[model samples]
Target: EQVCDVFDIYAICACCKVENEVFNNYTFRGLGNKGVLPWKCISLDMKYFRAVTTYVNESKYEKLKYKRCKYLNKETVDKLQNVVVMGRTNWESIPKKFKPLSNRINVILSRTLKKVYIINKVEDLIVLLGKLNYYKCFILGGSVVYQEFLEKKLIKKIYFTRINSTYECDVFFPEINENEYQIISVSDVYTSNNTTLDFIIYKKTEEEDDFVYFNFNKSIHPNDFQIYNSLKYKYHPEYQYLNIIYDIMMNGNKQSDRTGVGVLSKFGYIMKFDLSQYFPLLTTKKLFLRGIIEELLWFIRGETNGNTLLNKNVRIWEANGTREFLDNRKLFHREVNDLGPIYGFQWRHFGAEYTNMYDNYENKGVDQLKNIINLIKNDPTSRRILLCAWNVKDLDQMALPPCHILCQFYVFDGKLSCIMYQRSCDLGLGVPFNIASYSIFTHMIAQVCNLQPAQFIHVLGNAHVYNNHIDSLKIQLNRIPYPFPTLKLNPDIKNIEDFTISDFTIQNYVHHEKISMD
Candidate 1:
């Protein structure tokens, strides 16, 4: 027995393919050799068909096709003879019947291939609207398109369809929480068919609060008594005499081994700590904050050639051979030898081979922050979240190898913390700037990752003063202690990638004494 009609809609389309082959055999023979027909007899020669033909030849055709054929001519053609001949015609006729009306909305409800096609179809609708100069547009779809638009934040309105029956199907809509979006309207309708459909429209409204500024200046107590003992026992005794006599003796002798001597000596001190507790600026000495901030910002802008800093009236590298030669020539704008990757170059364009002069680690810092935040939020027990500033492979190419190297992140009780490890530090000159820079970095990352800024753990491997900086270090040691300063960060930054040097500001800075290098 041959089955003319099947209960399944899937099999109906397949049956139509077979039926079309039989219909084409009869229709082709009737058309004859020229494949021509009278203009009055053939529907393709009608006025609406001429409009469609002209539209297809132009870019504006796509927009006009649906409006001209689907909306304008749809009703008048429905009454024409012999249009509804088979099951294929019945499926095609449904859209055409409602096309003439302006209030009709397309409701697409198929999961497999139809859902995928619907997204493309919606894109076509958007293009059509653009061509026709129509500003308003709405899309209704199943789970896939809804989820895609929702993730992109492109969906301004959501219309959910709810059915009473527990219809068993392989596919399902994603489970959406009611708290995430606000419900605007709900409508219930009982159809003539044995089905009840409930329509619910929702709009997204809820947003997470800013978590970047919490406990930014919290106090930390040091626990390593051995480290404290070491500071007093080994470091203080060896340098105590020099520290006391720094200001009293300034002979300007070439033999006097003191910091800032001969207009070239890069003298500094190094202070070691077992763990980070207090801020590293020696409370014992006066520190330069504006100079440090300017230096950091200059570095961040990828101006590693060094002449820019010289132009800005900063002479940190004036003693270097290139700067010295440029100074002698009186060529202020002269380009200095490539100093290679300094701070900003490493942070912004690290390892970007095309434009970058060397391997960069700034992206590595960003990725590390994201990973730590995720670990802390999802699995705080994980110990793999760490950031390394030192790239060993790039060491040979570096003008000056990184002093402060690896850093790690820790999460406890929802509070986020950071630990920085420096292999070499100058106690008097360099350590202060290094501590302030890294601490500010920690605070910035904490804000971006939605974590509360906690204690900073600073570990030093080699903490000592250069021989030339001993007198300056001594002067710093004699001065009275001052309060640690606060670093302010821009609250508008949402992602670590978006932060700039301008986003930071220092507040409440006060210093008692100046310890000039010899």
Candidate 2:
């Protein structure tokens, strides 16, 4: 779930066909225990612009002008019956016995003390407009109250004042983007405690827009930031997936790749996974942890053939390992099923100087897996604790070049962290497993080094979505993600070098439906 957090499906907002097949169902969102903040109303002609310095004390007398509207001539009053909406504190500031202030409706911005055509939602306005006859609606302000309608695009004409003084204050009116608004006229000068002030009316500019949607995530509701505070989803399990679909929809460059599989590709991206707090297993879709785990163990056994994994019911690498798949690429290594210099092989016997897989690996170029482990145990903090599985010298021998090229490790505070630089990543299909694979590696290395697992940062060089998978990825973004699972390590065993698949256990592993790319 990249964009939304709760529902899997929503009714599209009849219009604003979002370029990608994502969503536009303007649903209500919240931030509290219930996570929703229902609100009401919209008004113009009611905003008050304080001094640049927020000097409200000087406006005590100026505020008097607001209490009584003398500018309302007989014709003006006849044509414009007014309503004022202000904060609760603003309501309390009134002269008590004046009792509701004559000649106008006083709508309190406070919940329940609540106005003009009093609508709590858009549906209210749609129905109320037919039943009532009115000249205009005036929304009085107190900054917070003014912001709602301003952002909702319900506000059009605005009469705001500016005080010629600079003072520091936390509360101030929202700044209107000059691009979206223009000043219509300026009023003659008025004085509030020797400070020069004048009212300037602005008109919201109408422009052709591509999209219109509110950022409810702005968290302006009465609920304190519990939505933000309570959130513990893997910050990047992977956010890259969301960006991939978004980029392809927006700035993707049309290209023809090796597969004759058309794609919309983007250049580079980076993502992080916090292992101490949670597993980076993707929650956007249900995962085959059995296959993911089994394949990893198979690779750790230094296998160049997929049959080892295929035998265990993990056939992800099987299709490509087929005889025809190999013969087409001239990738035979004395045996039809053997994959040459792939991850498992390059990791263990980089330049497998051996004449054949069965040959003795005496003085093979370098044993990356063994050396990397020794480095972690001896010089845990060394920047050189690196593993290289992308051997250009062996690229010709490989069935396919490595997507995950090389990785480096960092040990700090007795915790191990990893950063892998991958040359390519398929956002919909490959990246999630790539995220988990390295995260698990970091965990194992840390356990062997008597340290805690920290984080895994993946940097991608060329990322793209196969055009056909666009709708599926969009659906993934539409769903909300659940909290990450906890990884239970078999602490009794101290050596990751001697580990097996049974050494791992996933607890509280919550996920969504499996998204099939094939």
Candidate 3:
């Protein structure tokens, strides 16, 4: 279930000053001078800590955890408050007036202290939280406690307040593994008494951060734009997708070219869909399901002729396969309906010389799809499990070049995930299709390989909204999205190639009527 007792354990600390020389990973700085914080306390930082920790939705917490954990007495479920831990001296330093800290369950890690939920060891707190099913356990520390919990790898996330100025101190926070954490949230600089402070949240992930920080590269701080919009909308993937439209309307680079309609473009857009949780079909408008399934199956079958899809009543590739379009690409000698060496061709028979789409070239080139499946089944941890459709040498032969160029599959802890990179994304029309396709692709592979589907990460190189689609997009933005539909794959089908539209079912698919685009 991946549910551990201390799954929500986090650390909160403030550090001061850094120099060229390194003590642990950062320069040695004081956490305290004469038993109190080294410098005058930043009121904003304190307020932020309290605001984040103390605030909770009691009814929501009780309803969810009580129903799940079934903790002892019905009345005891109300005790599910956030736990804040500190060492004995650190607790004493908080002045008697705020000793226990209002609206929080205070935990003291101390041997001598006899008052207010005192414990000598961190394990005791873990056991206590595990027993009570605590919401979040925060480590608000002295040096020893911080060092101990961090060294043991118990702290999964950290809230840090980094003071710009230096002061005399006797204690310093243990240097952290900077490589192990990624900054998830960064706050704008709050200047008080001419000294600047930055609030940052560092979260742990298995992989390194790869996306180019296009919008927030400068220190990753959140400004008024983020704060206002974030409060206005819940940070769900549906809302995130909608926000991209808003971002394009407000901040995107206005350009004219490509399909002659012009666009508002942005670069390096990334979206993540948890395949285990939801199917990720956009709910703002209805999408063509038959085309998505047929196209994917066609890709899996490694067929190169668009006429094959036409035979299946899928006309998605008809425009690209016309004889006129073939002539436009300088393929004067080619016949109509031949999408030469396109997605399926590159997918199945990569590097095979192209004569005509009708020629059967079995056992000729690399079967990347089969190889990826084999890798997932055998060497699950290898980083080389990748499927590529952008055949550089054969791009000129393709009717329409691949937009989704590369996909890398990852297997970890008996689950499958994938990251797909699309070089050119038509945000309005293409993005949703790409998401559902890859999500189902990941699900299909996971099913065949005896694993669960985990995540599908879509990375777009140049994401843009066409000018003609802006009004339709604005209508979508105004509509509230419903819960994503659940995709039910036939459990009996054990092979990737055995899937058909009959074997798939989309349950509870609620969406607004389709919005037509120009």
lDDT of 1: 0.42
In terms of lDDT, model 3 sits at 0.77
> Tens-digit lDDT track for model 2 on 1-518?
11111100001000001111121111111111111111111111112321111222333433323322233211221122333444555456445795374444444555554443244453344233223222233454444555665675656566554333333333445556656665454443332342333444555562334233343344112133222222233233444455455666567788898889887888878777667656767766876567877777766676676667777878878776778888888865446557766887777777765354445554566778888889988887788988887888888777788888888999888888899998987877887888888888888878887888887899988888887777676667655454456667788877655777788887544456777875
Flag regions of model 3 displaced more than 4 Å: 1-231
Which regions of candidate 1 are displaced past 4 Å? Answer: 1-281, 294-337, 342-381, 497-502
lDDT of 1 by residue, 243-280 (tens): 32232232211332234342212222332321122233
Ranking by TM-score: 3, 2, 1
TM-score result, candidate 2: 0.56
Of candidates 3 and 2, the better by lDDT: 3
* Clash-forming residue pairs, model 1: 243-474, 259-468, 269-426, 269-427, 269-428, 270-426, 270-427, 276-458, 350-360, 351-360
TM-scores of the candidates in the order shown: 0.40, 0.56, 0.58
lDDT of 3 at 377: 98
lDDT of each: 0.42, 0.57, 0.77
Task: Assess candidate 3 and give its TM-score to the true structure.
Answer: 0.58
User: Which consecutive 10 residues in model 1 have the weakest lDDT in total?
Assistant: 7-16
RMSD of each: 29.4, 16.9, 20.1
What TM value does model 1 have?
A: 0.40
- In angstroms, the error of model 1 at 22 is 99
